[PDB]
Ligand binder design. Structure first.
Ligand SMILES: [Mg+2]
Lengths: 240, 147
């Protein structure tokens, strides 16, 4: 009935992620990711609604949860065992999430656990009763709704977000001829209908006809769309 | 455990796509969590890797596999766009890595997800594969021969 603790937990922190799908699972980790190690970290079981609140948002954690985990986790920074202010692993028996608030009251840093330690968490919380902590109870072009990244790998999510970054920049340029070009690249059979249309009406059709799903057509379109923008091209080169 | 055993960034993009397609298969069926059956459904939906050809070599097309899976599961009512892997579905992923290690592979491809599905044992995917008469060792034989 004491506080559960994990030791030597490998984490892959993702900072400032409002959406859980950006806190990548272990099978999505990359060799280029900087993986870190938690010497000791407390483990909490909460009901599903609280877990979802921590996992898919950046809002204030329950005060009782913070004081429960305050300075109970330790990392080895520069050959010295160091206290962390608020860092903990939380689960509802299904999802599992490591959190480091780096001193905030919100889950600034989030990580998934490696599979073997997930299974360890499930076995440790088999007989445990969830803690309530007295808890009681959006999307845009630079922060995609989950329905629009459904079924995509980490790589495809990143290329798709880059594509709609470029489309968002295309909006601010307000060039009618440019948006007519790119829409015709996506849908060349609307040549007659779009020609009375304003820049804004055409950009809307382009967004509406691309936002759903992913495909080789998407990938090829994004590769052309970003040409000439060194910032976008740098992002593309890191992913491909 | 031993950190010389712990190696990250090894899943091939096609293996990650199988696991990504599994969330789509689940929500298509209206389910609230990704189980072993949805990883199997995602595996045969990909259908371009070593696992697909191994299943074809054992006379199992994606059609036959889909209907056997559908024969053992229902359709759900879940509408939450945020969905999680079941604990046993994560077991499949863990066993996939364990299988790659023991075969001496420095990557985790779709062939290891297939073997992880069988090794998990208790789930729908293991049932379906056993129901269609593919044993762990026959599946191993077929994967190793294809490589
Ligand atoms: Mg593969």
């Amino acid at each position: 009935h004491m506080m559960l603790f994990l030791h030597d937990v490998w984490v892959n922190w993702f900072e400032g992620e409002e959406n859980g799908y950006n806190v990548c699972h272990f099978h999505e980790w990359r060799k280029e990711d900087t993986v870190e190690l938690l010497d000791q970290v407390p483990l909490l079981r909460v009901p599903s609604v609280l877990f979802h609140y921590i996992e898919n948002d950046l809002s204030e954690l329950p005060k009782g949860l913070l004081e429960d985990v305050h300075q109970k986790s330790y990392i080895r920074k520069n050959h010295e065992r160091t206290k962390l202010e608020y860092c903990f692993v939380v689960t509802d028996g299904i999802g599992i999430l490591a959190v480091d608030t780096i001193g905030y009251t919100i889950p600034v840093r989030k990580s998934r656990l490696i599979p073997r330690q997930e299974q360890l968490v499930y076995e440790m919380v088999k007989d445990v009763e969830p803690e309530t902590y007295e808890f009681e109870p959006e999307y845009h072009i630079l922060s995609l709704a989950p329905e629009h990244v459904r079924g995509l790998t980490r790589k495809e999510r990143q290329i798709k977000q880059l594509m709609f970054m470029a489309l968002d920049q295309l909006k601010g340029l307000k060039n009618r001829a440019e948006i007519g070009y790119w829409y015709t690249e996506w849908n060349p059979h609307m040549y007659e209908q779009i020609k009375r249309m304003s820049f804004e009406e055409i950009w809307d059709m382009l967004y509406n006809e691309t936002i759903e799903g992913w495909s080789d057509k998407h990938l090829a379109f994004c590769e052309n769309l970003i040409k000439g923008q060194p910032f976008f091209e740098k992002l593309w080169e890191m992913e491909n | 455990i031993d950190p010389f055993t712990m190696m990250f960034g090894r899943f091939t993009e096609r293996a990650q796509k199988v696991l990504a397609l599994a969330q789509e298969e689940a929500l298509r069926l209206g389910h609230n969590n990704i189980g072993t059956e949805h990883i199997l459904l995602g595996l045969v939906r990909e259908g371009e890797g070593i696992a697909a050809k191994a299943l074809q070599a054992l006379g199992l097309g994606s059609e036959k596999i889909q209907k056997e899976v559908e024969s053992l599961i229902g359709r759900g009512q879940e509408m939450s766009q945020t969905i999680h892997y079941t604990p046993r579905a994560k077991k499949v992923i863990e066993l996939s890595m364990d299988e790659a290690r023991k075969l001496g592979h420095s990557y985790v491809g779709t062939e290891h997800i297939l073997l992880g599905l069988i090794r998990e044992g208790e789930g729908v995917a293991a049932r379906v594969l056993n129901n269609l008469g593919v044993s762990l060792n026959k599946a191993r034989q077929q994967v190793l021969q294809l490589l």
